[PDB]
Amino acid sequence: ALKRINRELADLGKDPPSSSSAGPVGDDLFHWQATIMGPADSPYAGGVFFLSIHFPTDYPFKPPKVNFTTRIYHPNINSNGSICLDILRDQWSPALTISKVLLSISSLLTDPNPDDPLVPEIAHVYKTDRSRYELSAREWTRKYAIG
Amino acid sequence: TIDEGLYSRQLYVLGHEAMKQMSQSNVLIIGCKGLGVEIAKNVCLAGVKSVTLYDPQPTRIEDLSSQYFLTEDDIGVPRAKVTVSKLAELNQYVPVSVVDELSTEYLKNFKCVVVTETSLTKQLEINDFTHKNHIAYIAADSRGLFGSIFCDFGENFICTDTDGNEPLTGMIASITDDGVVTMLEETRHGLENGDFVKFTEVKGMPGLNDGTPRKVEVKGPYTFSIGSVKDLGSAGYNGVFTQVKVPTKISFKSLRESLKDPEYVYPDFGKMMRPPQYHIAFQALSAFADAHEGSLPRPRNDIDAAEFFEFCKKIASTLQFDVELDEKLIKEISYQARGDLVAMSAFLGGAVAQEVLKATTSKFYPLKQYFYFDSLESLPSSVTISEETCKPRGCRYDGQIAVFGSEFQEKIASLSTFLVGAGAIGCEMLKNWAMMGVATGESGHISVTDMDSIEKSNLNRQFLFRPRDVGKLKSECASTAVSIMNPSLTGKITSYQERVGPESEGIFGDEFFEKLSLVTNALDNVEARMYVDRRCVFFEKPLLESGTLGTKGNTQVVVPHLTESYGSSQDPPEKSFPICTLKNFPNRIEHTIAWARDLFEGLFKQPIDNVNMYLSSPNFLETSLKTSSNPREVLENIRDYLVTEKPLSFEECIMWARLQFDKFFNNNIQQLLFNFPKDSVTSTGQPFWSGPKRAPTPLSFDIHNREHFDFIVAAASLYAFNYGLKSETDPAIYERVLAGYNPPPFAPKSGIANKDKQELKSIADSLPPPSSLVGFRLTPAEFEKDDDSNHHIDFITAASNLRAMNYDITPADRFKTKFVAGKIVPAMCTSTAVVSGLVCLELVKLVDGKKKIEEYKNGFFNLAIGLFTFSDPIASPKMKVNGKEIDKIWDRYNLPDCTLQELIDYFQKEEGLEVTMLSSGVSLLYANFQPPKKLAERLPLKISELVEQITKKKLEPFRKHLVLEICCDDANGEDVEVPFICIKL
Numbered sequence A: 001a002l003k004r005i006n007r008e009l010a011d012l013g014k015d016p017p018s019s020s021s022a023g024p025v026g027d028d029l030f031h032w033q034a035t036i037m038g039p040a041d042s043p044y045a046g047g048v049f050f051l052s053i054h055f056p057t058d059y060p061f062k063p064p065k066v067n068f069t070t071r072i073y074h075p076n077i078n079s080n081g082s083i084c085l086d087i088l089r090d091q092w093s094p095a096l097t098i099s100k101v102l103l104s105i106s107s108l109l110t111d112p113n114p115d116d117p118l119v120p121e122i123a124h125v126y127k128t129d130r131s132r133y134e135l136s137a138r139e140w141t142r143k144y145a146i147g
Numbered sequence B: 001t002i003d004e005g006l007y008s009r010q011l012y013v014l015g016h017e018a019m020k021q022m023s024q025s026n027v028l029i030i031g032c033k034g035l036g037v038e039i040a041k042n043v044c045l046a047g048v049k050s051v052t053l054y055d056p057q058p059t060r061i062e063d064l065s066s067q068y069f070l071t072e073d074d075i076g077v078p079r080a081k082v083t084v085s086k087l088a089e090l091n092q093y094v095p096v097s098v099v100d101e102l103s104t105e106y107l108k109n110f111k112c113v114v115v116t117e118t119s120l121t122k123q124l125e126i127n128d129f130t131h132k133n134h135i136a137y138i139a140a141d142s143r144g145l146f147g148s149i150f151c152d153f154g155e156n157f158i159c160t161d162t163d164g165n166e167p168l169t170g171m172i173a174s175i176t177d178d179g180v181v182t183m184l185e186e187t188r189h190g191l192e193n194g195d196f197v198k199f200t201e202v203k204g205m206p207g208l209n210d211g212t213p214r215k216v217e218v219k220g221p222y223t224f225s226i227g228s229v230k231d232l233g234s235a236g237y238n239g240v241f242t243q244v245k246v247p248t249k250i251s252f253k254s255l256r257e258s259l260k261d262p263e264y265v266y267p268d269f270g271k272m273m274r275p276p277q278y279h280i281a282f283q284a285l286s287a288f289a290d291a292h293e294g295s296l297p298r299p300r301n302d303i304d305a306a307e308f309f310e311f312c313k314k315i316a317s318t319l320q321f322d323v324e325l326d327e328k329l330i331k332e333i334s335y336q337a338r339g340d341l342v343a344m345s346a347f348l349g350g351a352v353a354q355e356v357l358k359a360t361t362s363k364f365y366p367l368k369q370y371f372y373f374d375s376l377e378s379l380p381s382s383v384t385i386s387e388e389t390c391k392p393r394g395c396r397y398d399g400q401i402a403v404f405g406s407e408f409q410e411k412i413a414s415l416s417t418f419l420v421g422a423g424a425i426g427c428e429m430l431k432n433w434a435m436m437g438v439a440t441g442e443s444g445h446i447s448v449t450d451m452d453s454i455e456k457s458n459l460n461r462q463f464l465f466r467p468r469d470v471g472k473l474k475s476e477c478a479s480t481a482v483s484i485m486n487p488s489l490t491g492k493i494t495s496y497q498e499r500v501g502p503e504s505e506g507i508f509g510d511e512f513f514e515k516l517s518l519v520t521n522a523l524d525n526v527e528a529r530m531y532v533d534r535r536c537v538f539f540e541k542p543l544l545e546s547g548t549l550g551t552k553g554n555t556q557v558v559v560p561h562l563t564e565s566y567g568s569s570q571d572p573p574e575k576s577f578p579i580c581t582l583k584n585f586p587n588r589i590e591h592t593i594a595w596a597r598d599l600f601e602g603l604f605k606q607p608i609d610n611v612n613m614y615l616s617s618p619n620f621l622e623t624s625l626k627t628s629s630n631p632r633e634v635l636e637n638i639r640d641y642l643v644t645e646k647p648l649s650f651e652e653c654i655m656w657a658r659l660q661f662d663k664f665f666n667n668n669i670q671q672l673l674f675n676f677p678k679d680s681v682t683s684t685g686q687p688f689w690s691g692p693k694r695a696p697t698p699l700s701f702d703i704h705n706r707e708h709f710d711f712i713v714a715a716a717s718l719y720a721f722n723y724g725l726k727s728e729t730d731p732a733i734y735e736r737v738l739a740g741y742n743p744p745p746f747a748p749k750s751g752i753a754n755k756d757k758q759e760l761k762s763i764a765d766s767l768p769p770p771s772s773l774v775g776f777r778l779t780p781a782e783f784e785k786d787d788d789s790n791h792h793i794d795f796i797t798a799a800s801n802l803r804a805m806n807y808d809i810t811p812a813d814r815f816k817t818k819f820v821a822g823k824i825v826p827a828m829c830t831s832t833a834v835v836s837g838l839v840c841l842e843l844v845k846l847v848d849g850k851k852k853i854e855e856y857k858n859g860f861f862n863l864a865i866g867l868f869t870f871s872d873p874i875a876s877p878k879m880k881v882n883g884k885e886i887d888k889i890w891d892r893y894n895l896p897d898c899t900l901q902e903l904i905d906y907f908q909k910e911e912g913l914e915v916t917m918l919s920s921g922v923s924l925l926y927a928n929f930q931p932p933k934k935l936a937e938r939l940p941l942k943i944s945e946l947v948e949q950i951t952k953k954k955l956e957p958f959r960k961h962l963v964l965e966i967c968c969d970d971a972n973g974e975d976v977e978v979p980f981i982c983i984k985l
């Protein structure tokens, strides 16, 4: 529990994630506030997205609760910030680090999966009218993820 | 006509048909001693048609060793006559009678016959009749730490279900022409060779949709084969396969035939040569009793042991048994012939009651046929066990003194135990402790804690509670009942109503835990189990964990400095479906039930909470606007539930329910089909609505349909309850109101600055001020599965079935909906009895203070298949710290309340370790990577002051220690684990 959380925190500290920066809130180990930088080769370029990570008391035997805070226009992310990640609901195993979760979220941001969407309207726009999806994503990442 | 309010948990194990067939069966029980009374109690709680008792022998004192329906005022009265009255109260649907005399013909009046405490000649005489007339015959025996069970259900027993598992079902990706059926991605069918399956909804091969079962030839974890489907088609796409279970014919043998050539059931594979020894030993016991006017060998008597061994040799020679007799084991059976232990009685009674239920219901695979069990590892070795100590003292504990002696009785009578929970296992544990005389001495004591109250459904497996006690505290009732059973426990039992958790450390503190001898868990959740395990680890107290699940059960023992704790092992967690599956694309009824539960919470619980918090907290809106994920959603909920959609009568509630029906079952599906039409394709060209995704279809409100009306009634009633109106159930008003409804038009929308904050403020100021509404509160709906008059399960069932109709999923009834939504754990009385027996057999090892780890046995069993297994506990892991052997679990550092700097210096100088992280509770007290200013501010403070400052909460006066988790590195920088720190305040 606490020892595993601190091991992951130190591993993040020892090796800089470059594209991410996770740390405890205040002095509580069961509530982290991570930061993700928008991938360069994506509509979210030049954006900073804040994530809230809530470790369950049974960590790592139960998945952490990762929720977006900055608004994002993505097919697999809804307005509450819930992320459609298979490794967070039922595929979780006590062998995944927070760095792996952040890398998975960054990869998801790199390319969405509209075949199994979480926001059907955004997925429909992505599949049919790609240019309008690009414009909407740029507008959202310029209005919310900047400043 | 089964009373589902009482058999709620048992029906999830047996079923409606099994119980219907069970409630028409008669059971006769011969022998009303501890084993007989245990069997009768379990059968009465199960719910058979009636029970008849036959035991005309007058009561004696030693019979109180395991008979809990006998008192010292009943000495000299036949046991059946004084037990029938107390047995008749357990269940009101199961009459209990007594027969003064037994005749052979009379045996035809019964469906099952259980025989205990009977000679072998009488057993043969009974079985010779009950075998040729097709009557189930069970014979049970308990001698000291040994037990025997024999089952004979006839030569043509029909077993419909052989394992108790639900039929295996799965989804198919493709079926080739060679019969090769393939599952979907990363899906294991779980089938085995010889199983039967039937296919449905198969596209391209209609022939397989008939439903005829077909053989299974497993070829891999993901694919199997069914044979040749050449004629039916060339290739099949998609579909669902479901296993078919066929009846099995089991042929038994009579007792006379099976004495010569028995068929053993092995409860343990480490000792496979013993059952052949016990087979001779019990027959020799019967012969010795018949040769001495029914007198068993005296306890720990050498002459009787020699004579009994001579009888064993004679029997082994006569029956041509080519087995070498083990003299030590046989003479041990001789010594404990007069023993009567309540733990062995409980274990065997649970097993025999399960066998009776198998005989009546023709379900589960029975024992076939002999089952010989022993717990000889429980015999004490730290006390004197001889003829002098084991002779009877003329007290109610003679049956236990004959096995353990008087010194061990004095050891038991001074125990100071702590029982967590007072459920079914708690009641059984308290009964066993009362019978064993636990804490009946001067220095003994028992403490039982449980915060729950007695409900109707708890009376099925908790026999210490009566219908007149419904609504009272469990702990007080249990303590009173066990004080009634054993009068010596008057004033030796303390009952609390406290939940064992972090908030109860002021009651279960250092003083409370420093006087205990052992802790027994009777809980049902993992959080409390882990907490109690941590407390026991810190205080170094033995712990006894036990759990049941339907017909399965397990028991584990935690011994300080010997074995690992409860938290060192991991169990399969609960399954939570992906959010995208539940939200848009379900394919099973569980998804729809989960969605319905979320809908219930979001409609009748969350908005009411927001409204109530808005009217109470003066600064709620400002906090929500910058803290809540969707402040707009909160404002919309408050507005809608306060001003926009506040009902004034029940008609408006009905209108709102109709509107919500349209919102959730007609409009969202239209939007989804507008976004993803039924003919759309994925990026790879495959059709979108194929495989795990099922195309939905909107529902048009038809009032005459039962499901729509049920949803309307439930939703309207719950809304009225939220707003405190008068609900109604007459269909006339519903049909009158709903006729005059004009559906608002709906057309799906294709989509295509900082004014949003202005709109939010406009919505906020439109709400009435909190001052204008003083004392106005809305009642939230707290989910309650056990009450059938609150429309909770009805609403969930209606919503789930309507969503299933949307996606053409098979709807489920209210029974399965209550099972799934309520997270009901199936439970049985027999499993509880068995686990209590095993735990009480381990308790006598704990009392004796056995040191070797091979002398303790964790136990697992499954009564659906008659499986019992026992394995040694896993030893606690060791480690090397500074060239010393440290136990990982049971070792700690004891330190004063020194400053942080002094603690770091102590760890650097003594252990030669560099501290890099130090935490207490859920707070990070010290980390190596913190800015130097923070450390310079924190270093010169004491640990107690540091914790008070970081946690912003003063330490409670009853606090006497702190548990610190420390991670440190060695000199070279390699991480080394160290035990936790116990700072003494």
Ligand SMILES: Nc1ncnc2c1ncn2[C@@H]1O[C@H](COP(=O)(O)OP(=O)(O)OP(=O)(O)O)[C@@H](O)[C@H]1O
Binding pocket: B009, B420, B421, B422, B423, B424, B425, B449, B450, B451, B452, B458, B474, B498, B499, B500, B501, B522, B523, B524, B525, B528, B825, B827
């Ligand atoms: N943290 C806890 N502290 C103390 N007692 C607890 C705790 N958690 C559970 N219990 C008690 O454990 C007992 C568990 O018994 P059991 O699960 O058979 O009953 P139940 O949960 O009331 O019934 P059912 O599960 O059949 O609806 C209950 O008395 C419950 O009060």
Ligand SMILES: [Mg+2]
Binding pocket: B452, B453, B455
């Ligand atoms: Mg309860």
Ligand SMILES: [Mg+2]
Binding pocket: B524, B825
């Ligand atoms: Mg429970």
